[PDB]
Amino acid sequence: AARVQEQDLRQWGLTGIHLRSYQLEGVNWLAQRFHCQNGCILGDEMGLGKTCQTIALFIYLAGRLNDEGPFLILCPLSVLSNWKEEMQRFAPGLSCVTYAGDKEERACLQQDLKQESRFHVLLTTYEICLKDASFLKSFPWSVLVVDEAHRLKNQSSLLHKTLSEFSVVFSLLLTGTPIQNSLQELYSLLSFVEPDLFSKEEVGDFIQRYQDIEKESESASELHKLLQPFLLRRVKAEVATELPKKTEVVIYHGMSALQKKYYKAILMKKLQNILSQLRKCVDHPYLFDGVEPEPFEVGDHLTEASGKLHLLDKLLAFLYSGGHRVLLFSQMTQMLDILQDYMDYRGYSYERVDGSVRGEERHLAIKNFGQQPIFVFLLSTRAGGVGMNLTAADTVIFVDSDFNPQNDLQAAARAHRIGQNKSVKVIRLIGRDTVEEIVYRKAASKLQLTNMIIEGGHFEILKFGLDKLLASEGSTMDEIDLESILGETKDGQWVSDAEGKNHMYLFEGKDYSKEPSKEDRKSFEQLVNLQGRSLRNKG
Amino acid sequence: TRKESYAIYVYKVLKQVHPDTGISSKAMSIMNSFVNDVFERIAGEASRLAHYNKRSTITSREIQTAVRLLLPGELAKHAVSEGTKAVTKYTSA
Amino acid sequence: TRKESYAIYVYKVLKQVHPDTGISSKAMSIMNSFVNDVFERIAGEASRLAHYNKRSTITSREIQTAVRLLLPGELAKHAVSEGTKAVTKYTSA
Amino acid sequence: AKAKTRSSRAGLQFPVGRVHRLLRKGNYAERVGAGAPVYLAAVLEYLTAEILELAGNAARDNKKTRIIPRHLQLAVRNDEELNKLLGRVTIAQGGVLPNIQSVLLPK
Amino acid sequence: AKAKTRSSRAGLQFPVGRVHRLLRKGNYAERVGAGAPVYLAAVLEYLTAEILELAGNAARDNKKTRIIPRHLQLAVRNDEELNKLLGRVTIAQGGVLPNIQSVLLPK
Amino acid sequence: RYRPGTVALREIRRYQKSTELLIRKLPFQRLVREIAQDFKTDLRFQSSAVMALQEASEAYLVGLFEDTNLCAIHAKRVTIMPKDIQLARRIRGER
Amino acid sequence: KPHRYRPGTVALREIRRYQKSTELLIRKLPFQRLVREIAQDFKTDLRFQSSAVMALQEASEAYLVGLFEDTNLCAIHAKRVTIMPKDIQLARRIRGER
Amino acid sequence: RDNIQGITKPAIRRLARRGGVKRISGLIYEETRGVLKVFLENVIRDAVTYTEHAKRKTVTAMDVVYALKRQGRTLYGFGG
Amino acid sequence: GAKRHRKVLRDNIQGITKPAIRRLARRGGVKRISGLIYEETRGVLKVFLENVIRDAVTYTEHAKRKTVTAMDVVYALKRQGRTLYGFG
DNA sequence: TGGAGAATCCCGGTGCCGAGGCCGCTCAATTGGTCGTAGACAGCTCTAGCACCGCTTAAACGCACGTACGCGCTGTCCCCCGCGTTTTAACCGCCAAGGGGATTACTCCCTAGTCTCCAGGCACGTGTCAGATATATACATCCTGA
DNA sequence: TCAGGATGTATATATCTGACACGTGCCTGGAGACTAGGGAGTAATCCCCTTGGCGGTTAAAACGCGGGGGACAGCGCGTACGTGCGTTTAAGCGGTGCTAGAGCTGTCTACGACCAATTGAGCGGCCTCGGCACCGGGATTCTCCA
Ligand SMILES: Nc1ncnc2c1ncn2[C@@H]1O[C@H](COP(=O)(O)OP(=O)(O)O)[C@@H](O)[C@H]1O
Ligand code: BEF
């Protein structure tokens, strides 16, 4: 079709940002896709500016072919403010209505159904769009934008079925992560995009036809050709150069006395789900209710109760001394509460957006993230790493190492972003000889399944049986790492500049082990099994 | 015709318990009714326990489960102890 | 595997009684439980009736006596009449 | 000889053969007469018809056409003999009968 | 060989052969294990011994050397667990437990 | 002359120590035969059958009177009244 | 002055409303937690089907409703309209549960 | 022929005394006679049903025991 | 300020709240309720549940299972003279 | 002493999911023989249930008196109900993992069934002591008066 | 408040008496030995469903306050129930007599178990539309301060 230049968007209302070459290519791609089919997937990598491309598409089809109809945007609660700010920053010619609030304000906005194009873009979230689906089923929307569209991974989702029966002309999905965590999830995305072509009945065909795991150019090229007119991925390495590079550094740690005691106790003796209790024990014992000496005061006993917390405090002292602002991600909210109490003790300036905080406190927290010279950024992986711009910090530290790698990847990408100036140093804290190591390796194995397809068509367990060193039932505390902590992290002027005892680098390098000493488990569980005329009234 | 009862066994147990105490005939008939009633309770509970699990054999495990279901509190523990002791002594011979 | 019940027979009886009324699934499960409960009550009563008289066969006389023992008032009389009618019709044919 | 069911011979809509099998597999006696299953199936059919007719009346009194557990509960508890038969029985999602004592009502 | 009753092998006084015959002839299941009669006889003997212990104590409290139904009633109704076991049982010629309410006594 | 309530307590203690039957044999037997004539004519009774009926009936009545006394005390009374019997029997589930 | 109802009117309205309905009157999660806590005292590491807890809740609610009916009769017997713990104790005594 | 009046007022008073009752209203006697009549009617109906099933013309003690056991009131000391 | 533990002290029997007990009493026909009824009702419910759950767990352990089914609860209730219809 | 206000009921519209009808298949009910034993029937015995009479005396009955208890009334006070505002956790949508329930195949050992033999237990007879009854006798207890 | 009397009740000794405990003969039911077959233990597989957590809304729970109505204590009265005495009735006990019916025995015979072949009834799976649930609106009802 006809190419769109930057001056067309300049005249048509887009006045904020000067676009980029790949952004302009994406806008033209979106325009031609809108002109010929029903739906697409703008799957650029995180931090490349998908929101700018969608706003440019709105400006285009609102001032070129006069498609003046309503646009619906669905996004998580934490990026609602970002959408609202950028919508009026870049495209102030379109009136945007943030359809949020309690039931009463949403009803008062229900009453504004005068239908005189008083709103061009309606902005809401998943939960609201699922609670008020009936009101949001009576509009002829032209474009439906689902930001962070990897929530539609499961096809039996209520959101999938609810959004499928909408009067949308063009469904646009935004997803930064490599969607292909499993073939069925990618097929669910495709079935949402093109429900007629990709029928839900062909799930078995899609999985069977593409069981290939090697290069296999004969089928890799086939699937690439299949996904040519639907998906559009651009990576920072090939597109967004000249950005400071990120260097992931995984750091190992040991245990503590009571940590080993409870680790072995759960491994031997609610305990219906074992994996959750093991991970809880590795993170911090104090989040068990029965192990606290019930002191209702802060103190210094917190650091020695966990090796992970000890190493974290060492890292935090080093980073604060070196002048580094840091993000902090975790899975369980209890561990975040423990970190918040520790930060309050040590007098660290911290901010906390956690999920189940509120709608507006997140906006205030994001403002303070960058306004004040605040040091610690407390975050939850699922409710903090989904689209917030936190470029002020330059160090991402994971204390969780959750199951699938996409969450951690996108959480890390929250700091490696367009507009970053310093280098980003990703830090992981996984315990040595622990179930955390197995979760990490299982995640790493799951991750390099989508790397294969990208590079080809786009470019005994719960043990971890080295418990012999965990059968010492001591501390195994680290103090030599203090002099090497500058060796792993070479800080220059406000930047981080350019596999031994407790550290390992990540440059697409692998790690493996074969769980040597299960004899400890067997022996200590054998120890575990080692641990007439009745006339009840008379004896 | 001959009619059977538990009189001689009740008397043997009584001589074990109280070596110099007797018992009248009305009390003996009451104890016979008691033994029959408890037998029927336990046997019926074991029968329906075996039917619930689609089995066709009444074993000592089902008798033990019926004893735990019927007898209250501290009576069940001692009864289970005596039953287990008797079966262990019986199978060793 | 499969699971047998009384749903189709309950439905046929319902369509005899109320030709235009339907029934939900929870109500059908309740009716199935009711039929099973009444069946086991009558069967157990007839079983112990046969045991009392030193018989080994459960006949229609035992079922009739169990119905008269278990059902109250007019329910017993009408149930006896229906069962007797059914047996008389079955025997002649 | 074309097979004719025993339920049709007796004139019933309940399964005589299934009731006979259930009687033989329940360890109720050593042996089972020929007319016991017929008589028992007739009694079961009668009781089913009684409760279904009362529950259908109760459902129609509520301007509904499908019987739910509430209608069964109302039918059972409003009948003087079915309530004695089912005195120790709880019906799930059945509720209770509407009844307020006279001393609690206002003067 | 020399015969030896199963009760002697089990170390019991209640009969194991008679309990086995009653279990077989009671239509309780198709088959009966070898250890079921021993367990049941042991349980019955233990319960009899408990009742007789308490009844002999009650008889000795009244300076009697023979157990009568009154002593069995006192033994059963004074013990809490035997009272739970026999809560719905009537003992003939047993009487009641002496008990007067506190308000009926003069004060 | 004794004050009202003393002979009552002596009778309570006396009849709670004893175990004999408190209803006369012949009137009870006549009542049983009269009741049985409404079910089958020309019946016969073993003596032990009537004895068992009397034992069961007296145990039932004594238990009912215990419940009635509890219900009467509940209402700050010492006299048992028909409403107490009705309440006890309804709570037991017999009414 | 605002509108107020006399004491006892909303009580009668609630009586009618709750005797007309059939839903469960206890919250699901607290009851399930209580059931699991009680079951921990018999065998550790037990699992429950959802229908098992549903059956337990139905039985418990039916039991409590019947007990409250008997309690109300016992309270009326004493010329009261307020039910008190002694009425519950009397009802459970007459039932044969103490 | 009014044999329910053979359950005299002194007999009902003795039963109440064994039950622990200290003072008795004057309307208790007719209520107790009605209650006893109902109880006896139920038990005797069941016993006669058991007797008729065995094709006998004599109500035995075991029929009464079985009737009482069926109504949930086990009786000890009369055989079985 | 002790934000890591300030919620877990509710004693699950207290999850049977006063409004729930009032709703049960209203369905029972009770017009006015004393203030000491709630603890008494909680104790009664706890005793009832202990009996039924003990029987159900016994039935479950006999079958050598680790999951308490609805049939175990139905058998435990029929065991106590409380037949429940509608759960198979 | 009627009107204001909150609650509930009747009416119309929409939509949605579960009850109802169809359909294919498979396994359980039916049919047809054959055997063996449970029960129906006739007969004989003997016991125990019914009926009656006569006498003794224990218990029921009727009556009178007086007292204490049930019941109605009144007054106080406090506690439970009704209602408004805040806050908390129930509930539902969603994501993970993995344990355990459910099925199948195989085989082996445990129980039923039969025959033989013999000792435990039951019916029967006999003596003697535990307990019931009677009579004196001391002691506790209830009640009234000074 | 204590003294004392009349009543009732526990206590000690003597005397029957009949029921319990023991010994005997035998017979039938339990024990020993053997065989055959199928019920159940056991290993392996699979996938459903259970548990634990987060995220976010929102309805219910919790807290506080004000007041009125119900619980409870106290008081008076009058009636109905307990107590005691003299009269009457019928229950209890014994003894005799008769026979109806329960109980046991022996002999068939018809009926129910068992087995093999076959086919239709019922169960699981799959649409699909109408009954019911939610919803907004108008109207009547019932309560409460005049
Ligand atoms: N042309 C541009 N120039 C500068 N910054 C841009 C441009 N386009 C997008 N961005 C940055 O992208 C951020 C938001 O875009 P976002 O959708 O988060 O990118 P991504 O999709 O890569 O995560 C904003 O902070 C904005 O500064
Ligand atoms: F993918 Be952008 F951070 F919304």
Residue numbers in the entry:
A (entry chain K): 28 to 296, 310 to 499, 516 to 554, 567 to 599, 610 to 617
B (entry chain D), C (entry chain H): 29 to 121
D (entry chain G), E (entry chain C): 12 to 118
F (entry chain E): 40 to 134
G (entry chain A): 37 to 134
H (entry chain F): 23 to 102
I (entry chain L): 14 to 101
Please give the exact wording used by the authors of the publication that reports this structure.
ALC1, also known as CHD1L (chromodomain helicase/ATPase DNA-binding protein 1-like), is an ATP-dependent chromatin remodeler that relaxes chromatin and plays an important role in the poly(ADP-ribose) polymerase 1 (PARP1)-mediated DNA repair pathway. ALC1 contains two RecA-like ATPase domains (lobe 1 and lobe 2) and a C-terminal macro domain. Chromatin remodeler ALC1 (amplification in liver cancer 1) is crucial for repairing damaged DNA. It is autoinhibited and activated by nucleosomal epitopes.
The competition of the H4 tails with the inhibitory macro domain for binding to the same surface of lobe 2 explains the requirement for this nucleosomal epitope for ALC1 activation. Likewise, motif IV underwent a loop-to-helix conformational change, with the side chain of Arg402 binding to the phosphate backbone of nucleosomal DNA, as typically observed in the activated state of chromatin remodelers. Therefore, the release of the macro domain frees the H4-binding surface and motif IV to interact with the nucleosome, providing the mechanism of ALC1 activation. Whereas the WT peptide bound to the H2A-H2B dimer with a disassociation constant Kd ~ 3.7 μM, the R611E and R614E mutation reduced the affinity over 10-fold, with Kds ~41 μM and 113 μM, respectively, supporting that both arginine residues are important for the anchor of ALC1 to the acidic patch of the nucleosome.
